[PDB]
Amino acid sequence: SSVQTAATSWGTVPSIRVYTANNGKITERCWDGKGWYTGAFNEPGHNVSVTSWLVGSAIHIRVYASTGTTTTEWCWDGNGWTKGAYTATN
Amino acid sequence: SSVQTAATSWGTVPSIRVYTANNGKITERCWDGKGWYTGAFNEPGHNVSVTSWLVGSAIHIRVYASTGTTTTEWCWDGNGWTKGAYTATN
Amino acid sequence: SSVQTAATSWGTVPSIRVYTANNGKITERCWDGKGWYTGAFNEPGHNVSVTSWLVGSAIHIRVYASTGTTTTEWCWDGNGWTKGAYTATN
Ligand SMILES: OC[C@@]1(O)OC[C@@H](O)[C@@H](O)[C@@H]1O
Ligand SMILES: OC[C@@]1(O)OC[C@@H](O)[C@@H](O)[C@@H]1O
Ligand SMILES: OC[C@@]1(O)OC[C@@H](O)[C@@H](O)[C@@H]1O
Ligand SMILES: OC[C@@]1(O)OC[C@@H](O)[C@@H](O)[C@@H]1O
Numbered sequence: 548s549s550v551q552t553a554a555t556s557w558g559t560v561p562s563i564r565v566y567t568a569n570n571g572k573i574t575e576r577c578w579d580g581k582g583w584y585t586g587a588f589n590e591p592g593h594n595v596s597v598t599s600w601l602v603g604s605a606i607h608i609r610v611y612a613s614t615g616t617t618t619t620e621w622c623w624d625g626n627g628w629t630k631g632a633y634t635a636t637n
Numbered sequence: 638s639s640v641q642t643a644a645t646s647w648g649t650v651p652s653i654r655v656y657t658a659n660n661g662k663i664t665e666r667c668w669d670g671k672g673w674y675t676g677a678f679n680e681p682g683h684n685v686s687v688t689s690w691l692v693g694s695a696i697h698i699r700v701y702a703s704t705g706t707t708t709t710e711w712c713w714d715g716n717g718w719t720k721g722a723y724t725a726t727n
Numbered sequence: 728s729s730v731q732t733a734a735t736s737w738g739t740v741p742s743i744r745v746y747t748a749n750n751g752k753i754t755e756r757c758w759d760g761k762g763w764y765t766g767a768f769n770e771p772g773h774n775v776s777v778t779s780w781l782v783g784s785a786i787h788i789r790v791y792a793s794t795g796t797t798t799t800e801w802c803w804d805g806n807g808w809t810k811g812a813y814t815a816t817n
């Protein structure tokens with residue numbers, strides 16, 4: 548089984564985040580113009596998607612991690628990853 | 638097996654749409670700033686991807702639903718989901 | 728068993744790019760307002776994700792193609808697809 552990725556970007560530099568689900572574990576690689584480095588994201592999940600939006604120059608990322616029929620939303624709003632209010636009855 | 642998701646967002650509130658493939662069916666959950674609810678999208682499919690774009694204040698969404706090697710495009714343009722012109726030789 | 732897609736778009740026409748992973752081959756279908764056609768992207772991979780951003784009117788596209796634990800970044804920056812500096816630790 549191949550890894551599964553999800554990717555988002557913002558601005559014109561750009562900044563890029565790539566999330567990889569590997570055997571149930573989702574980690575994050577980051578680009579800000581000067582080389583790829585490992586990010587703070589680390590959550591369980593066999594499938595992953597992501598969206599993001601800017602307010603001014605402040606980025607907001609939402610990552611959706613799925614295992615079985617359970618999708619968990621994870622939020623970045625400048626100060627650490629927190630669990631979001633997303634629910635879905637599957 | 639796990640569900641598969643795809644997400645899109647627009648604006649600064651923001652608005653968020655999350656599409657989930659589950660056992661041959663794709664459904665949609667929506668956020669417009671005050672709680673999650675279930676959206677109009679409801680189409681068969683085992684894999685899903687999405688993109689969207691604003692034209693002034695008007696959002697357009699395209700959802701790509703695939704089963705086997707067949708991929709159907711569904712269009713939102715302000716009032717109702719309609720089948721799109723996408724084709725691909727697979 | 729179903730094919731896997733990823734989509735991105737830009738501008739207000741819009742331009743759309745849909746990437747399809749089918750049996751270890753990722754190919755590209757393009758829309759610019761006047762009908763669908765096949766693009767120049769052809770790379771090996773079992774999973775695909777995409778992000779894009781505009782620099783003025785010039786589009787920049789990053790496609791992340793994964794097989795096993797290897798993810799390769801492919802870069803469009805106006806004149807041909809080249810391999811990007813993305814690496815990970817998988
Ligand atoms: O690259 C730095 C960082 O804070 O940027 C925002 C998020 O992508 C975080 O996971 C990441 O650690
Ligand atoms: O600030 C976090 C939050 O309110 O952001 C908007 C949506 O993603 C919600 O699900 C989420 O809980
Ligand atoms: O959130 C309300 C709604 O009209 O927004 C646009 C589309 O996502 C529709 O499916 C959805 O029901
Ligand atoms: O308005 C619908 C439509 O023209 O929008 C742009 C593309 O998504 C086309 O495939 C689609 O048929």
Ligand SMILES: OC[C@@]1(O)OC[C@@H](O)[C@@H](O)[C@@H]1O
Nearest residue numbers: 744755757765766767768803
């Ligand atoms: O539509 C023409 C084209 O050059 O546009 C940019 C990239 O998507 C290329 O693969 C594609 O062939």
Ligand SMILES: OC[C@@]1(O)OC[C@@H](O)[C@@H](O)[C@@H]1O
Nearest residue numbers: 578789800802810811812813
């Ligand atoms: O111009 C190519 C490049 O520098 O663009 C930004 C990032 O996608 C890098 O991985 C990539 O090598």
